[PDB]
Amino acid sequence: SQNLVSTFANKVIVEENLVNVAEIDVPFWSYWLSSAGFTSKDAFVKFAEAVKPKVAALSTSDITNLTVAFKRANYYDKDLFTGIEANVSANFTKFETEQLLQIVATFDAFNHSSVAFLDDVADSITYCNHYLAPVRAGADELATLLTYYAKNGHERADLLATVARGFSEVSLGKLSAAQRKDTVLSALKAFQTFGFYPESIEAVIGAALVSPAEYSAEELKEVEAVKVAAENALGGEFVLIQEG
Amino acid sequence: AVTSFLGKAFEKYFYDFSAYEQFGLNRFLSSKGQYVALRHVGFVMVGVNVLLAANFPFNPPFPTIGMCPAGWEGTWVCQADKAKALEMYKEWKKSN
Amino acid sequence: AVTSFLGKAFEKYFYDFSAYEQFGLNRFLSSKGQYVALRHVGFVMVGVNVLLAANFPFNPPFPTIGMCPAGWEGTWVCQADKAKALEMYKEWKKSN
Amino acid sequence: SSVRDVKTGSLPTNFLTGVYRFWRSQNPAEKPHDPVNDRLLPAVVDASDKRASIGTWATTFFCTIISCNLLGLMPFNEAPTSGLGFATGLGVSVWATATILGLSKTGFKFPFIFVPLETISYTFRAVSLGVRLWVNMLAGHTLLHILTGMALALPFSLGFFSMVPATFGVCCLLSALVGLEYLVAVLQSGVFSILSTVYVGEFNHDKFIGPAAKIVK
Amino acid sequence: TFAQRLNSSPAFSSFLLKREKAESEVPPSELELEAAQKAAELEDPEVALRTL
Amino acid sequence: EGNSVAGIIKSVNETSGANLLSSLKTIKAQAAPIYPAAASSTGYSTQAKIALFGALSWILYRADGQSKAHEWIVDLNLNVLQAAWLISFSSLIPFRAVYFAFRGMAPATASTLNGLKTFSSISL
Amino acid sequence: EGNSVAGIIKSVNETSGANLLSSLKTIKAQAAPIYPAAASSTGYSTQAKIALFGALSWILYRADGQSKAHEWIVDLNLNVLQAAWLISFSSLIPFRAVYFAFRGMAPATASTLNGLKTFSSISL
Amino acid sequence: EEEELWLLTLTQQFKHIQKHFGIDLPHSVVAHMDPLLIKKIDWETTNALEDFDITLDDMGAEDAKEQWGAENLSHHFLPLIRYRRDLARKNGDRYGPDLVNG
Amino acid sequence: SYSAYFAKAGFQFPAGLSALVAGIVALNVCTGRPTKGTKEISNAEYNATPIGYLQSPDQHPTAFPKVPGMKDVHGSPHH
Amino acid sequence: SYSAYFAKAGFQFPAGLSALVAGIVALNVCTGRPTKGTKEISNAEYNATPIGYLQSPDQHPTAFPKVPGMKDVHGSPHH
Amino acid sequence: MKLLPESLQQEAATAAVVASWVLWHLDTQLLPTIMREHKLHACWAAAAKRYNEKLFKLNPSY
Amino acid sequence: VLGEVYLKDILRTPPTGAIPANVPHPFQTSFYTYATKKLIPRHWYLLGGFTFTITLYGILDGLRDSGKKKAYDEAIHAGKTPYTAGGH
Ligand SMILES: CCCCCCCCCCCCCCCCCC(=O)O[C@@H](COC(=O)CCCCCCCCCCCCCCC)COP(=O)(O)OCCN
Ligand SMILES: CCCCCCCCCCCCCCCCCC(=O)O[C@@H](COC(=O)CCCCCCCCCCCCCCC)COP(=O)(O)OCCN
Ligand SMILES: CCCCCCCCCCCCCCCCCC(=O)O[C@@H](COC(=O)CCCCCCCCCCCCCCC)COP(=O)(O)OCCN
Ligand SMILES: CCCCCCCCCCCCCCCCCC(=O)O[C@@H](COC(=O)CCCCCCCCCCCCCCC)COP(=O)(O)OCCN
Ligand SMILES: CCCCCCCCCCCCCCCCCC(=O)O[C@@H](COC(=O)CCCCCCCCCCCCCCC)COP(=O)(O)OCCN
Ligand SMILES: CCCCCCCCCCCCCCCCCC(=O)O[C@@H](COC(=O)CCCCCCCCCCCCCCC)COP(=O)(O)OCCN
Ligand SMILES: CCCCCCCCCCCCCCCCCC(=O)O[C@@H](COC(=O)CCCCCCCCCCCCCCC)COP(=O)(O)OCCN
Ligand SMILES: CCCCCCCCCCCCO[C@@H]1O[C@H](CO)[C@@H](O[C@H]2O[C@H](CO)[C@@H](O)[C@H](O)[C@H]2O)[C@H](O)[C@H]1O
Ligand SMILES: CCCCCCCCCCCCO[C@@H]1O[C@H](CO)[C@@H](O[C@H]2O[C@H](CO)[C@@H](O)[C@H](O)[C@H]2O)[C@H](O)[C@H]1O
Ligand SMILES: CCCCCCCCCCCCO[C@@H]1O[C@H](CO)[C@@H](O[C@H]2O[C@H](CO)[C@@H](O)[C@H](O)[C@H]2O)[C@H](O)[C@H]1O
Ligand SMILES: CCCCCCCCCCCCO[C@@H]1O[C@H](CO)[C@@H](O[C@H]2O[C@H](CO)[C@@H](O)[C@H](O)[C@H]2O)[C@H](O)[C@H]1O
Ligand SMILES: CCCCCCCCCCCCO[C@@H]1O[C@H](CO)[C@@H](O[C@H]2O[C@H](CO)[C@@H](O)[C@H](O)[C@H]2O)[C@H](O)[C@H]1O
Ligand SMILES: CCCCCCCCCCCCO[C@@H]1O[C@H](CO)[C@@H](O[C@H]2O[C@H](CO)[C@@H](O)[C@H](O)[C@H]2O)[C@H](O)[C@H]1O
Ligand SMILES: CCCCCCCCCCCCO[C@@H]1O[C@H](CO)[C@@H](O[C@H]2O[C@H](CO)[C@@H](O)[C@H](O)[C@H]2O)[C@H](O)[C@H]1O
Ligand SMILES: [Zn+2]
Ligand SMILES: [Zn+2]
């Protein structure tokens, strides 16, 4: 029986029959296989064609699972993400901010944007979801959504007021010191792109000025470029609070 | 979802996935009706050997016909009376 | 039907049928609030006397304060220790 | 998978709203120094995250005890909190909930000759919170058992409907004792959950993570 | 009126509230009563057109 | 199910100028919210049958255990003392006042719903 | 619910002579019998959840009792001998032929329904 | 007749709530008429902020309490401002409230 | 009004009451100990013993005892 | 066709199966005798006895015995 | 009288099961129902000054 | 005009055909959502507080059961009965 198991192993338990079981529920199976590290381009081509007649009827949890799965596999199928962005645009009231921040980060990984998608995502975060949902988001996810709107030039000041609520000493403090640097430097470029300087930009600038040794000389120049621009917009002087 | 996939999965296994065709047993076997007779006794022989391999060091409650499993032949596994085999197993268990 | 009548029946009893008005207890009693205080203790006193009359010849598990029910005064009903009262009851039971 | 439909303004919804808002009122959130706006909104949500759910826990313990205490007053039924392991098991569970909340703040490390005496006063809250519930459900029912036996000795000995006024006066004192046990059943569920807000609310303190940077004027 | 709507609610069809009225606890105001009468005239939408 | 205001707009626009005023009560009823009519009476639910038989089985189980107790006659008369207060609570408790006291415990029922006003949403 | 033939007679009589032939497919669909469409998929019923958990609880209870038996290893291998025939019955039994053999057991399904003929009920 | 459907749907919806709320209004009809309000209220219970309006009352935050109720009913104006954004997009303009300094 | 809609649904239990009565019964039947007045015996003793000797008088109290302490069965007379 | 109407109703039990499992369980729990390897004892004996002495070895067989006749508990050593 | 039970762990785990069911039933079945009914009233009462002002500025009807 | 697609899943009128099903909360839909988002993050102090009491009372049950075993073996070794009598 040393070879009867090995004969069964080379023909039955193959990656191709792992795919043939995975064809029934692609948003479930591609999400959990890629979570286990199975990020293979040849299988995710077969995932993209199996789910394409089913995308328009997918739920918001299935769309978010499918979009995160194709981000971890790093596979871009433009006809798949067209139907994915047509599902988000048709059901934007049903989507959540926690789900849309994962969908936007996939749409920002490979540059894929529509003007209807940017409007329906901004309407979903600002009006269809709770206004304190960016507080629960995590600042690394909100800075990705800010960069995605800055790169497409889409100015939505109602969205920018909602996303800026998530930046604080709480949410930036939960990040790694290297990860806080990339979050601060990408949120300050997006706030300077639209010319929007909310009151919660004091936490983004203050996260850079309380620890400037992580930042370079040219980075502290563009931080204090935003700091003087927010000082004119908010009408005051920047001061660091010390507890006591 | 969890039930709708499992119905679609087992339907593919019951009908579409056949190991009689994928392994090419038409060369070795005559009929599909004699393959399922060999798959029947093959299922019994595996389930006998798996249930014994799941716990091999046991004294058998079934009567062995004067035969011993491995190189034991005097241990608690081969003892006829079970009251003696319980005392011999307790000495073997504390060492191992 | 069986439930719809019983709802209509008890609704008539709970609200429409009042024994405070049909018996004319306004002459004897001051308030309806003091009638339901007397109907409360009257319910307790009946339920005490009914539970005792449902089985009167019993030896009490509660301590009687040196008192006897009827003309017994030496029988098993009045015995202090229950091991003696069980033997005295068995002689009384075969006769009666 | 199909949840039931609820009428708005139902009496159990309005009762449980006022009950939950009462135990939430016992540990109110602290007013910050800064005015609450979009700058201070994540610090308010984070301060709410660091607060324990004492409002939810106390109305859990209020409803589970006032239901158990009133079972002792229903006919053919006894109170679960009249048993020792039930009532004291709830009181040690509250004390262990307050201790685990207090230990999770510092290090999960347990904090000259003064502190052994303050420890005895703290670990007596484990005993006294559940025992006060247990003795109140036991001693009121035990006194009811003795006085019902002494009230039964009169119509047993002095005739069933023979003489009324002596068994009337003891059935009035017995009826006022069951009404006192109705008051103790509601009060001991309240005292338990008041003290649970007090004990858990001792460790319900975290520092406000306010703005580290500000654009003044 | 509001007290008339509580009397038609399922709470007052229950057993302990079958013989109770919501007007007995808090009576409707005359401004509440005259607006219930004014609304009953305007439930015919032809009358609301000719009024307006 | 489409919304009823767009059905009002569609039915009023499609009607003639001659029969507009007569057909306004028909358009009013087509946009009226559904209030389901009183269905046929059914005596007991399945879960209501389990609840009443289960409470009857529990009462008979506890009365059988109380009767076999040592202080058995004290246990059955404690059921009389306990059931007497259930009768007195039906007599004493102002069930309409307690209903409105509980109604004032929740802020959703203690006040009327203050929201959208008429002048802010007038459509001309 | 009125019957559909009287609705056919009412709709055909009320139609114009000009639009009679065009509206015949509309009157055909209004009298078509209702065939309810495929509803949304639900995974398990409540009674299907009791049946599968109850069979799983029964299997685990009987496997625990078989394993504690005196001839315990014979009991667990008798489950192998019994489950092997359940696999062989899925392979051998002609499930379409057995379905039509059972269909011929009842006289209601062994023949087609012979009843009312067309010429007897022709209405001219 | 341009925006009459949105203005009369808000009137039709609130008049039906205020007639029936606290008396006999089912929770299913509330979640039918305002699905996004029930979605936002369910977010607070999910994220352990079910007492958040009690928390704002504890700290005296009357302006944050007014912001809380307005942001939970902010989807009532969303049918209008998606319509007015599409009107400005067909006429080539930018929408006013979508801009930072506009 | 919606009053006739709410009279359509009958009595219903609380939503997870089956899990409550499952947990309460499983705490009373999966005790891991003999059941309150009984003792586990050998299979040799159980088969040889009559039913009347297998019962004990304390576990069978009289339903309405005329004397406090009456038992329904007398048990084994062999001491 | 009526196929989608019959897929609407899920699995259902037979119509009086609750009365069948009520009668089968009541024949197994209302036996009127001690439960298969146990013996009723006095309340004085039950309270004085530890749990390990209250159990018997025959009523606790080993789940997968290496020797036929292994018991999980040893019971009372007092004979 | 009954002072100590037959098992102290069984009576404590019964209290733990009953209180965890009430904790589950409150957080899952009662408080989502309470907060849907409370916060519909509470959000309307907290917005109605700003809601009616925002709606007044929007409509061109006047 | 504003044409009912702008208020499709946002604003609905009171229903005219049938009362819909109630929209479930996520905690009513699945226990796993309640366990991972609220029960373990917010209420693990109670669950650990219950776990303390069940394990502590199991220790006090073991001390009570060892006290019965010590008193049992003391009466067997002394030639006594460990329990006094039945009342029957
Ligand atoms: C004076 C002579 C007596 C004449 C005899 C007839 C008069 C009736 C006497 C008492 C009969 C009691 C029967 C009550 C039970 C049956 C009623 C019922 O359940 O029907 C409805 C009414 O329900 C109730 O009656 C509940 C009322 C309970 C409130 C509490 C009242 C006072 C209780 C006092 C405590 C008693 C404790 C024990 C004392 C010994 C509900 O079912 P439905 O289907 O008809 O409703 C439609 C929905 N499907
Ligand atoms: C507080 C002040 C004093 C007030 C009066 C004293 C209080 C005690 C009075 C006793 C009356 C209690 C309520 C009366 C209930 C019986 C009458 C009744 O109305 O019956 C209805 C239902 O009554 C009951 O069934 C309630 C019984 C509750 C007892 C619970 C015992 C539990 C035993 C089973 C547990 C099994 C759990 C299974 C889990 C799946 C009929 O239901 P329906 O289908 O026709 O629809 C109407 C629904 N609104
Ligand atoms: C170890 C051996 C034990 C053997 C003893 C017998 C026990 C057998 C175990 C199986 C019996 C059945 C288990 C019941 C649980 C599953 C049913 C369920 O999920 O609940 C409801 C299904 O609907 C739901 O609500 C699902 C939600 C889950 C139910 C409860 C969740 C867990 C609550 C426990 C507290 C959790 C917090 C603490 C955890 C450490 C149905 O309940 P109902 O009949 O009372 O309501 C219907 C009335 N119309
Ligand atoms: C840090 C967070 C941890 C989370 C865990 C939460 C735990 C507490 C939540 C409430 C659940 C309590 C149920 C657990 C009971 C455990 C009792 C135990 O371990 O001992 C049993 C061990 O007994 C057995 O060996 C038999 C197996 C018993 C299994 C118990 C099943 C009941 C589980 C209850 C269902 C919980 C869910 C229901 C709704 C809340 C029986 O106790 P005993 O004193 O009578 O016997 C001891 C041995 N002589
Ligand atoms: C005969 C030739 C050989 C054939 C093959 C061998 C036979 C054995 C094969 C085993 C398969 C048996 C049937 C498979 C059932 C499970 C798969 C399934 O289809 O699940 C359905 C239901 O399956 C079951 O639940 C059946 C389980 C039956 C086991 C019975 C055990 C009883 C235990 C609980 C008793 C409690 C009684 C309570 C009384 C109220 C799903 O139901 P649904 O709600 O989605 O709607 C579909 C209805 N058409
Ligand atoms: C002595 C103490 C015993 C204690 C042990 C526990 C037993 C407790 C007894 C109560 C438990 C529940 C009793 C169940 C009977 C009432 C339920 C019923 O009537 O049956 C069905 C209600 O619907 C009916 O079919 C009513 C018809 C009556 C049921 C059976 C009639 C009697 C059959 C027995 C054989 C009679 C012939 C011989 C008689 C000598 C529901 O059954 P199902 O859940 O399996 O079906 C639902 C599936 N969707
Ligand atoms: C001429 C027409 C007569 C019609 C009557 C039809 C009777 C047969 C129909 C089928 C029903 C059979 C159920 C009756 C069982 C009677 C057994 C009995 O009397 O003895 C019991 C007496 O035991 C007891 O004292 C405890 C009480 C037991 C009550 C039995 C309840 C079960 C009833 C089954 C439900 C029937 C309906 C369910 C669906 C068919 C237990 O037997 P045992 O040998 O284990 O113990 C004897 C004493 N040591
Ligand atoms: C031993 C001490 C403890 C005893 C037992 C404790 C029992 C706890 C339950 C009682 C709680 C009832 O508490 C209830 O709180 C609610 C909160 O919604 C208050 O609710 C109401 O307050 C005020 C004034 O009445 C209204 O203007 C307001 O609209 C409404 O919210 C009630 O005024 C109060 O009655
Ligand atoms: C007709 C008059 C009606 C009066 C109604 C108001 C009184 C109601 C009585 C119910 C009990 C009052 O409840 C009371 O709540 C307060 C806070 O609110 C608790 O107060 C507690 O708060 C926190 C909790 O750790 C501690 O910081 C504080 O030191 C402690 O006192 C009391 O311990 C409790 O007794
Ligand atoms: C389970 C058995 C019962 C145990 C119940 C124990 C908790 C009882 C909670 C109710 C007690 C609090 O009682 C509460 O009193 C407050 C005032 O203080 C009332 O509050 C208000 O009532 C009404 C509002 O409609 C007005 O008169 C007024 O604005 C105010 O007094 C509450 O409406 C009432 O519910
Ligand atoms: C529970 C496990 C299974 C145990 C089952 C035991 C009972 C089995 C009953 C079926 C056996 C009888 O088998 C029965 O044969 C007769 C002929 O005799 C067939 O009767 C008919 O079948 C078809 C009709 O469509 C035609 O070929 C023909 O008219 C006739 O042969 C039945 O359709 C078949 O069902
Ligand atoms: C040990 C001896 C007993 C063995 C076990 C007995 C099993 C009993 C079940 C088998 C019964 C099946 O018996 C079945 O009877 C039905 C009655 O409807 C017959 O039914 C059919 O008969 C004939 C011919 O097939 C058809 O023309 C007719 O339309 C139809 O009614 C089937 O032909 C037969 O297959
Ligand atoms: C044998 C001893 C029996 C008595 C046992 C009692 C001890 C109970 C404590 C269990 C500790 C482990 O339990 C684990 O604690 C860590 C921190 O340590 C928590 O960790 C975290 O939880 C959530 C985040 O989701 C936060 O709200 C919390 O502040 C944080 O500490 C875990 O969510 C909990 O699962
Ligand atoms: C606050 C209310 C309670 C007041 C009483 C507090 C004192 C209780 C603690 C007594 C401590 C002595 O307990 C000591 O600890 C161990 C745990 O390692 C106990 O051991 C216990 O657990 C083990 C396994 O978990 C089992 O054998 C058994 O359940 C029990 O004996 C020992 O019996 C004893 O040696
Ligand atoms: Zn008692
Ligand atoms: Zn066998």
Short mmCIF file of C-alpha atoms and ligand atoms in Angstrom, two decimals, chain J residues 19 23 26-27 30-33, ligand 7:
data_model
loop_
_atom_site.label_atom_id
_atom_site.label_comp_id
_atom_site.label_asym_id
_atom_site.label_seq_id
_atom_site.Cartn_x
_atom_site.Cartn_y
_atom_site.Cartn_z
CA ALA J 19 -46.29 11.77 20.16
CA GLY J 23 -44.35 7.57 24.13
CA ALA J 26 -41.88 7.85 28.63
CA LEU J 27 -41.52 4.07 28.41
CA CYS J 30 -41.08 6.04 33.70
CA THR J 31 -39.92 2.51 34.40
CA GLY J 32 -40.85 2.49 38.09
CA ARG J 33 -37.51 0.92 38.99
C1 LIG M 7 -59.51 -3.02 24.89
C2 LIG M 7 -58.87 -1.74 24.37
C3 LIG M 7 -57.89 -1.13 25.36
C4 LIG M 7 -57.19 0.11 24.80
C5 LIG M 7 -55.84 0.37 25.47
C6 LIG M 7 -54.67 0.19 24.50
C7 LIG M 7 -53.38 -0.21 25.21
C8 LIG M 7 -52.27 -0.59 24.24
C9 LIG M 7 -51.95 0.53 23.25
C10 LIG M 7 -50.48 0.93 23.28
C11 LIG M 7 -50.15 1.82 24.48
C12 LIG M 7 -49.17 1.18 25.45
C13 LIG M 7 -48.78 2.12 26.59
C14 LIG M 7 -49.14 1.57 27.96
C15 LIG M 7 -47.93 1.01 28.70
C16 LIG M 7 -48.31 0.37 30.03
C17 LIG M 7 -47.10 -0.20 30.78
C18 LIG M 7 -47.39 -0.38 32.27
O1 LIG M 7 -48.51 -0.37 32.66
O2 LIG M 7 -46.34 -0.57 33.18
C19 LIG M 7 -45.67 0.60 33.53
C20 LIG M 7 -45.83 0.89 35.03
O3 LIG M 7 -44.68 1.56 35.49
C21 LIG M 7 -44.94 2.65 36.33
O4 LIG M 7 -45.44 2.47 37.39
C22 LIG M 7 -44.58 4.06 35.89
C23 LIG M 7 -45.64 4.69 34.99
C24 LIG M 7 -45.44 4.33 33.52
C25 LIG M 7 -46.48 4.95 32.58
C26 LIG M 7 -46.21 4.58 31.13
C27 LIG M 7 -46.30 5.79 30.19
C28 LIG M 7 -46.01 5.42 28.74
C29 LIG M 7 -47.26 5.50 27.86
C30 LIG M 7 -46.92 5.44 26.38
C31 LIG M 7 -47.64 6.51 25.57
C32 LIG M 7 -48.70 5.93 24.63
C33 LIG M 7 -49.05 6.88 23.48
C34 LIG M 7 -47.84 7.19 22.60
C35 LIG M 7 -48.08 6.90 21.12
C36 LIG M 7 -48.71 5.53 20.88
C37 LIG M 7 -44.19 0.46 33.17
O5 LIG M 7 -43.92 -0.88 32.90
P1 LIG M 7 -42.64 -1.57 33.68
O6 LIG M 7 -42.63 -3.06 33.42
O7 LIG M 7 -41.36 -0.96 33.17
O8 LIG M 7 -42.79 -1.31 35.30
C38 LIG M 7 -43.76 -2.03 36.00
C39 LIG M 7 -43.61 -1.74 37.49
N1 LIG M 7 -42.29 -2.14 37.96
#
